[PDB]
């Protein structure tokens with residue numbers, strides 16, 4: 559999928575988690591988000607069109623998603639243990655990683 563799709567996926571399922579009622583729904587949402595983040599990590603964003611894959615920006619862009627997956631994994635651990643409310647808390651905290659990347663490269 560392309561960068562925009564992956565970000566829609568990211569956005570939707572974060573809402574799904576905010577709304578969500580029980581553990582299984584949160585776990586499902588995060589798993590889709592995981593997939594998306596990993597896919598987005600492959601894409602070259604428009605603002606980095608002309609930069610070499612080796613460039614600090616490209617590397618820092620890729621690194622952004624490595625952080626994000628790391629955090630989704632944190633939330634999945636919780637969701638997995640059925641700790642729904644703090645799974646949601648973990649998911650909230652993702653938002654800072656999203657905005658941080660958006661300020662640089664969106």
Ligand code: HEM
Nearest residue numbers: 561562565568569603604619622623626655656659663664
């Ligand atoms: C879970 C946290 C995140 C959320 C909720 C999120 C949400 C969004 C949304 C709503 C858009 C607008 C899409 C559009 O214009 O069609 C977007 C775009 C974008 N996001 Fe994220 N995002 C997240 C994480 C990240 C991270 C970590 C990065 C960098 C590593 C990133 C990089 C970008 C870029 C470069 C765009 C521009 C879209 C384009 O020009 O095609 N996002 N994101």
Ligand SMILES: CC(=O)Nc1cc2cccnc2c2ncccc12
Nearest residue numbers: 599600601602611616617618619620
């Ligand atoms: C250090 C780093 O960020 N490398 C790369 C970062 C990348 C970020 C978006 C898309 N592709 C890459 C990429 N592709 C091939 C080889 C390396 C990279």
Ligand code: NI
Nearest residue numbers: 559560561597
């Ligand atoms: Ni793709």
Ligand code: NI
Nearest residue numbers: 599600601611
């Ligand atoms: Ni690449």
